[PDB]
Design a protein around this ligand. Structure first.
Ligand SMILES: [Ca+2]
Length: 223
């Protein structure tokens, strides 16, 4: 997260870190057994780390649970990032309390102008590289479809939305991938892609979670 703030430990209780020997992506806990992330975050041998603040220090609220299964969206295209969503099942159920909690799925899509909270452990610089140990946060609005398409001609599908600031300076970034965009207490987006980070006229692009609620529910019901 570039141009954000330190969230505070365990203030974003649905935020998870996906770990394969190291943090590589975010995700969102949606029930005791299941995490939503980006399909571009797929790999084998994932351990899901819940209750994290400093990802390099055991601070006392962590739950580390290996994944038993990953399900990439049936129509994910890695070239265009259309349908950039993946579900991960935990080998055991997480213990839920106020520091580790699920986030609700949307019942309606969000509108441009809605304010949201984007979070993660990704790069905090727009030029060059610095990875934080503690969770970073950014409040940002959803942008209009027209501004999003104008920013990224030929690239924005109906399964994507832009959020952030056209002026630059405030965005998600590498290492935030897969993590949440939460608006009014609902998971509306997944950190997906963008051109660089925090660049002028190049806002963040996010998977439009409201389009996938049916798929998520039916997949959980049968897996
Ligand atoms: Ca920790």
């Amino acid at each position: 997260i570039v141009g954000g703030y330190t969230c505070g430990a365990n203030t974003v209780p649905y935020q998870v870190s996906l770990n394969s020997g190291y943090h590589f992506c975010g995700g969102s806990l949606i029930n005791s057994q299941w995490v939503v992330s980006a399909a571009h975050c797929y790999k084998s041998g994932i351990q899901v780390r819940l209750g994290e603040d400093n990802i390099n220090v055991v601070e006392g609220n962590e739950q580390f649970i290996s994944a038993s299964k990953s399900i990439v969206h049936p129509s994910y295209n890695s070239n265009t990032l259309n349908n950039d969503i993946m579900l991960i099942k935990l080998k055991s159920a997480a213990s839920l309390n106020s520091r580790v909690a699920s986030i609700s799925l949307p019942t309606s899509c969000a509108s441009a102008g809605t304010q949201c909270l984007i979070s993660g452990w990704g790069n905090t610089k727009s030029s060059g590289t610095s990875y934080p140990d503690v969770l970073k946060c950014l409040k940002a609005p959803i942008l209009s479809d027209s501004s999003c398409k104008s920013a990224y001609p030929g690239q924005i599908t109906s399964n994507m939305f832009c959020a952030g600031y056209l002026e630059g300076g405030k965005d998600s970034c590498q290492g935030d991938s897969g993590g949440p965009v939460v608006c009014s207490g609902k998971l509306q987006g997944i950190v997906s892609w963008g051109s660089g980070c925090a660049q002028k006229n190049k806002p963040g692009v996010y998977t439009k979670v409201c389009n996938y609620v049916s798929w998520i529910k039916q997949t959980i019901a049968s897996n």
